[PDB]
């Protein structure tokens, strides 16, 4: 009756955290389960974290959703992966796509169970995909528009026709981004910091470049004003290693 979905957010309070206090951000990734709603309607609402400081409390941003292409409780065993990219590792990255443009690059990989989970790779045959959250954004290094959108979907797919075979679907129908949520999110952490640490507009010189998943810098050094809450402390952590699975299929 209903497909499974993903809906990733990001919960932040204001809070004195430790600056190894400061006045800066208390932030957890979560998700939220809903496969009721229309696609792109959750809401920015009040979450369960209250702020040691001064008694404020925690918004929770619904960031991005995917619902699965197919009917049932098996749609449970699709899943992802996300991590932002740092000049600091192994592979590089667009590094004059983002200077132009002024945003983060992204590696998202679809995965299924059983769990190691299993990678799903896409048409072309590669383990994952680039992607920036922003429109617009056009890369000579992949000769690709970038933008999750407009690409995701599309590129876990493949008609068959000058490929010749059976045509293949994506697990994902559709990948749905809260731009005014992150940008919201985004100015946030980097006005924070900007205040907190203000060397890192060295290389952070725009909101735009804020990592909001896995909230590390460009320079790849964890932001100082952020302090993240992982599953001790009811959180999520995305990444490389970092499982998320859609949820809440139902038969009938």
Same mark, same amino acid.
């Given at each position: 009756?209903?497909?499974?979905?993903?809906?990733?957010? /990001?919960?932040?309070?204001?809070?004195?955290?430790?600056?190894?206090?400061?006045?800066?951000?208390?932030?957890?990734? /979560?998700?939220?389960?809903?496969?009721? +709603?229309?696609?792109?309607?959750?809401?920015?609402?009040?979450? =369960?974290?209250? +702020?040691?400081?001064?008694? +404020?409390?925690?918004?929770?941003?619904?960031?991005?959703?995917?619902?699965?292409?197919?009917?049932?409780?098996?749609?449970? %065993?699709?899943?992802?992966?996300?991590?932002? =990219?740092?000049?600091?590792?192994?592979?590089?990255?667009?590094?004059?796509?983002?200077?132009?443009?002024?945003?983060?690059? #992204?590696? /998202?990989?679809?995965?299924?169970?059983?769990?190691?989970?299993?990678?799903?790779? =896409?048409?072309?045959?590669?383990?994952?995909?680039?992607?920036? #959250?922003?429109?617009?954004?056009? %890369?000579?290094?992949?000769?690709?528009?970038?933008?999750?959108?407009?690409?995701?979907?599309?590129?876990?797919?493949?008609?068959?026709?000058?490929?010749?075979? +059976?045509?293949?679907?994506?697990?994902?129908?559709?990948?749905?981004?809260?731009?005014?949520?992150?940008? &919201?999110?985004?100015?946030?952490?980097?006005?924070?910091?900007?205040?907190?640490?203000? @060397?890192?507009?060295?290389? =952070?010189? @725009?909101?735009?470049?804020?990592?909001? &998943?896995? #909230? &590390?810098?460009?320079?790849?050094?964890?932001?100082? !004003?952020?302090?993240?809450?992982?599953?001790?402390?009811? !959180?999520?952590?995305?990444?490389?290693?970092?499982?998320?699975?859609?949820?809440?299929?139902?038969?009938?």
């Amino acid at each position: 009756a209903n497909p499974s979905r993903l809906i990733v957010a /990001i919960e932040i309070v204001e809070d004195e955290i430790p600056l190894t206090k400061v006045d800066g951000l208390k932030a957890r990734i /979560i998700l939220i389960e809903d496969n009721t +709603s229309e696609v792109g309607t959750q809401r920015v609402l009040p979450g =369960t974290l209250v +702020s040691d400081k001064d008694g +404020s409390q925690s918004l929770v941003y619904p960031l991005f959703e995917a619902p699965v292409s197919f009917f049932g409780k098996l749609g449970d %065993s699709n899943g992802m992966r996300v991590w932002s =990219t740092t000049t600091a590792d192994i592979e590089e990255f667009d590094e004059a796509a983002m200077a132009k443009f002024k945003t983060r690059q #992204f590696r /998202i990989q679809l995965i299924e169970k059983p769990e190691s989970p299993v990678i799903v790779k =896409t048409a072309d045959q590669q383990d994952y995909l680039n992607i920036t #959250f922003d429109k617009g954004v056009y %890369s000579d290094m992949y000769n690709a528009d970038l933008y999750v959108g407009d690409v995701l979907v599309d590129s876990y797919s493949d008609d068959g026709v000058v490929s010749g075979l +059976s045509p293949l679907y994506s697990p994902f129908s559709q990948f749905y981004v809260y731009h005014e949520n992150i940008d &919201l999110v985004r100015q946030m952490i980097y006005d924070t910091e900007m205040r907190v640490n203000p @060397a890192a507009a060295a290389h =952070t010189t @725009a909101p735009g470049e804020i990592d909001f &998943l896995t #909230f &590390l810098a460009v320079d790849g050094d964890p932001y100082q !004003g952020i302090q993240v809450l992982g599953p001790l402390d009811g !959180g999520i952590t995305l990444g490389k290693d970092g499982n998320i699975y859609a949820s809440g299929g139902t038969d009938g």
